[PDB]
Design an enzyme around this catalytic site. Sequence first.
Site, PDB file in Angstrom:
ATOM      1  CG  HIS C  60      -0.616   0.358   2.374  1.00 52.21           C
ATOM      2  ND1 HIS C  60      -0.346  -0.561   3.363  1.00 52.21           N
ATOM      3  CD2 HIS C  60      -0.475   1.597   2.930  1.00 52.21           C
ATOM      4  CE1 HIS C  60      -0.005   0.094   4.464  1.00 52.21           C
ATOM      5  NE2 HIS C  60      -0.106   1.408   4.230  1.00 52.21           N
ATOM      6  CG  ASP C  90      -0.183  -3.986   2.477  1.00 51.26           C
ATOM      7  OD1 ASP C  90      -0.418  -3.189   3.357  1.00 51.26           O
ATOM      8  OD2 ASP C  90       0.100  -3.502   1.344  1.00 51.26           O
ATOM      9  CB  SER C 165       2.265  -0.500   8.256  1.00 47.83           C
ATOM     10  OG  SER C 165       1.897   0.848   8.130  1.00 47.83           O
TER      11      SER C 165
END
Lengths: 318, 318, 318
Positions: C60, C90, C165
């Site tokens: 992302h 992801d 993240s």
Amino acid sequence: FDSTDETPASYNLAVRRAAPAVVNVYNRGLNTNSHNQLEIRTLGSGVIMDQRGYIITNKHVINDADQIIVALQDGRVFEALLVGSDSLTDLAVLIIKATGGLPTIPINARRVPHIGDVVLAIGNPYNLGQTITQGIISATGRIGLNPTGRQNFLQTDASINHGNSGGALVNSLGELMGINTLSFDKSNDGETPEGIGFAIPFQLATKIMDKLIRDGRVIRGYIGIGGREIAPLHAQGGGIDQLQGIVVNEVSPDGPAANAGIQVNDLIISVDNKPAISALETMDQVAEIRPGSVIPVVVMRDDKQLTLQVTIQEYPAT
Amino acid sequence: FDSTDETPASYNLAVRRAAPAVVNVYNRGLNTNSHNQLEIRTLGSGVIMDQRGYIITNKHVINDADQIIVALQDGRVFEALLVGSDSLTDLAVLIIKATGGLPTIPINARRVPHIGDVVLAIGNPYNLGQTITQGIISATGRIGLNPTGRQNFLQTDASINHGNSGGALVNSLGELMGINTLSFDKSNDGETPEGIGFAIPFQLATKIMDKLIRDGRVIRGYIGIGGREIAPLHAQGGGIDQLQGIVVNEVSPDGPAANAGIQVNDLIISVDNKPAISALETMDQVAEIRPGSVIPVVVMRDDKQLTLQVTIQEYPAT
Amino acid sequence: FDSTDETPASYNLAVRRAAPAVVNVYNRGLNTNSHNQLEIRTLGSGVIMDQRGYIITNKHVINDADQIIVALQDGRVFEALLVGSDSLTDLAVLIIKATGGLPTIPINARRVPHIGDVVLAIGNPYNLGQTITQGIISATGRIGLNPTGRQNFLQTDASINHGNSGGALVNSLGELMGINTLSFDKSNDGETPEGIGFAIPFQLATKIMDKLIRDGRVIRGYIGIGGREIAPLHAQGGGIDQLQGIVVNEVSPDGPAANAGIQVNDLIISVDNKPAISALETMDQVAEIRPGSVIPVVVMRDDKQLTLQVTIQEYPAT
């Protein structure tokens, strides 16, 4: 089967050494509806800084108080005098006149806070009396008074709450690491983030306290210049043999630099005899200089060194 | 470069000693739409308290169950008998009839929980099987059964969740410190706070368990009096030589104190032969006294000591 | 009174060993409004995996980049080549061509992550530079590539954030335990849960990296069968003397199993010479088998053993 002789992992030593210095701060109003007296309009935490009775809390806990009351964990209650405050940091200082002997926050001016250190965020407030939380230092803060900086807060994942913000951030030894500050949307005690909370680093909190005690407010210096650093930065060699500096963008009109006079593309090399190596360092430096002060600023203008002489003014409203 | 021989900081010892006693609790319904059988209406955690098979979970996980099922980490599954519950604490007790030998929660009745102690909040539920979280004790709880108290919960910053609430709060040795309780807005498993979560202190959870096993419900005593403590409080000297007491505000009409009879400004000095030193202590004391009981209450009335005799009733609905 | 010689509890050792390998990842666009160049469309963390310059971040953070830029804590900046990515996890891998010598994440392939181990979640992003947080492992993850699993994430209560993240989850020694993954509602960097956050376990992250470097994408095998395990499960004896297996529910029409041909109630006992003991194990196994592969599947059909021969295809879109 034998827990009996073992010892549970614990931070209660930090608590025993630091908590008796962390106080309830009450903001009391006199009503207008039915006749008057004693309403609590808000409640928060504060920290006793020295014998003598100076206390830091948040400006937001004390705004518009008619009377400020302070209660210790030992049962003593005091009425407080507001010494002054500062919006940009959300700190205020109070003073209390006491009876032989106050518990004070342990403070170690030689300690260097490290990223990863354990911290406890000590307050009182909610259900009854005390919220304490545990986390780590996530990012060390800067200690500048420059009003545009966004890195002058230590960051932690210890929860910072309404039962938290006026109080002490401490490490496992009970040494003060910072002042708890509820953490970034506005009007006495609950927020939007999660994950990350904020405190005023303790050497900044101390600086701002001495400033309030002496002038009643945080007087910040101002030069009236916006600008960016020339030569490409970082990588500790790559290399040494060309002078850094701040290229000037913007010159506040009828600001100190404009008076004096200093023009857009002319390249600041030195301020008050310190090399102008970084935009950020240099605006923190200017902020601590007293207004009325006359200082030399060296520029390079058309391949020539000019020294101008500049009289610092106060940073102006909002 | 040599991690190889080192040992990672860890609480897995608490987990190995405590987790096998923490169980999945299932609330199964029989449908009304298409023909019937086996639907899971909610899921939660429970804790095995003793051999014999008594288990604490939350009342909210078991409400309206048609059948209560219990699954251990070792693979065994049981159907459970509901022994009873209590709304004010959100606890229920279950019993299971088992096959030679259950894993039980370690419990140390001599241990004194300290503010700052590390705790793990052990459940199962979500994605699959177990949520465990870590935090500290933020505030010790009281152990009272008085239905108006707001300080009968230990508070922690360990996250307390739907994968959490029916289970065990333990310290680094795996000793039980409290029962996890999802934490303060209503109807099976997700909340508003953040920062702070709650558990029933373990000596309260044990008390309430023995009460349910013996009466099927928590029977609380009642005296039918509201009132505040006279002489100004705290500061351990300032001083000793005047008797504390509870001035009476309110006397429930046709309550036990009204019968008996006791009047508004008359000053309680002693209850069931214990000095009435604190409003809060005294209402916890009354709450544990069995209904039907006749006790002496001493008051000062017009500078005179009256002893009245009062028959305790049950605290009445909602 | 003597903090002076004591040492504060701290995880700064993990930070010093692991953080220099954790990088800022920038996603830059060329505008369409006024003339073009250098806009940052999003920002995230990444981890340097080996010398050679392979880096993991989140898919992302990199989606739709025109150019991918990487900045180290030591000041070096690189432009990155996208090697490939995977939606279900992801993750994306990048490569950087560097100048004599990169800092890499410490990795210990012999270490077994335990529930209760301390972890730090290291990023950079927000106010300036670094968010680091501390928590524990709540649940170990599986390492499967099966696209329906819900237990292929390690779970932690360390806060996982936008400043988090893309980066590294490590234990107190600085060893990699997993890749941070922002945690379960959709579109670059802020979420709904609280309590619990997620990471790709490190042996899964390594597996997926080698897959991307070699095929440019995660190629997953597929058999085209839905089904549940026969004989009642768990309790380590109760007992041994009957063969487990997977009863077949559903057979994808014109899937590999249908071709071959295999029918609804016929009971899989073995797949590619491994006993079919568990639904979950067996679908992870099938997922790692290369498409084009021919494998034996043994079933029991009418009390008879049939061996069919099945050619694995790729798991098909979304």
